[PDB]
């Protein structure tokens, strides 16, 4: 399980 914080990410 991975949270992505950024522009262009899921």
């Amino acid at each position: 399980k991975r949270i992505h914080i950024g522009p262009g990410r899921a």
Partner: antibody, heavy 131, light 112 residues
Framework: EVQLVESGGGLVKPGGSLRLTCVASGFTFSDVWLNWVRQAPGKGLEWVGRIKSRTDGGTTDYAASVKGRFTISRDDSKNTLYLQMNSLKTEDTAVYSC??????????????????????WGKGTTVTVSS | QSVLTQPPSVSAAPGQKVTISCSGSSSNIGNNYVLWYQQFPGTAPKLLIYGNNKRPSGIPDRFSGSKSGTSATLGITGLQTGDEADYFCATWDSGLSADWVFGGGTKLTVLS
């Protein structure tokens, strides 16, 4: 020992073309997302666009101010990022540099958080659009 | 001529506190996370804060960050002459091209 070295900058007449190249070293190039940013004299940093990794589709995004005229591409084969500029306008005059999207990873209780940011930055190459 | 707005400069004496604001819109700061960078003349920007208020290893807690609505702030306590540099905020636009957006930078002078 990471770095990004761009080149190809110079003087171009309004309407002309220019091709900037950026070479990377010190990390696995194919795995990172790349950005082109620019800073005109006096103004603030402006994001030009990016090209995602091949693993993420290799698609490109462009700032509204350059879509249709600029094109980004990568050659993972030789750690090189490209910026083809067409129909240049004097307002495109600026220092162009490449950057990579890096990340700080934090392990939460149940999830793993990846916070992205422009990590490695090139020194830039100057592009002057003037008659 | 700057997507996010920050005061152009700020000054204080060593040992003092200081804060730098960064104003945006719902489309950027309001919707996402703010990052803060530090830059010294002739060098690449160094990540200072991410996820609005987190510090990367190596960054002392004299540095703090906060975000309220469409505005973000960076604080620095116990100023040292060595903190004299440029500071800019960044985020991304929640639009289709997902632009990285930047502040014009604020020059912080540590009275020497």
């Amino acid at each position: 020992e990471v770095q990004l070295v761009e080149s190809g900058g110079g003087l171009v007449k309004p309407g002309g073309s220019l091709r900037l190249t950026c070479v990377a070293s010190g990390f696995t190039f194919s795995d990172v997302w790349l950005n082109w940013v620019r800073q005109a004299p006096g103004k603030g940093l402006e994001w030009v666009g990016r090209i995602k990794s091949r693993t993420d589709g290799g698609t490109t995004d462009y700032a509204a101010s350059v879509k249709g005229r600029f094109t980004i591409s990568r050659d993972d084969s030789k750690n090189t990022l490209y910026l083809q500029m067409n129909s240049l306008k004097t307002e495109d005059t600026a220092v162009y540099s490449c950057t990579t999207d890096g990340f700080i990873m934090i392990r939460g209780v149940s999830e793993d958080y990846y916070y992205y940011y422009m990590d490695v930055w090139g020194k830039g190459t100057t592009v002057t659009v003037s008659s | 001529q700057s997507v996010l707005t920050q005061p152009p400069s700020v000054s204080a004496a060593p040992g003092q506190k200081v804060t730098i604001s960064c104003s945006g819109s719902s489309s950027n700061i309001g919707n996402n996370y703010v990052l803060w960078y530090q830059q010294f003349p002739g060098t690449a920007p160094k990540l200072l804060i991410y996820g609005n208020n987190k510090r990367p290893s190596g960054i002392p807690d004299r540095f703090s960050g906060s975000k309220s609505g469409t505005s973000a702030t960076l604080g620095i306590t116990g100023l040292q002459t060595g903190d004299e540099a440029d500071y800019f905020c960044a985020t991304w636009d929640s639009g289709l091209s997902a632009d990285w957006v930047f502040g014009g930078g604020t020059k912080l002078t540590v009275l020497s």
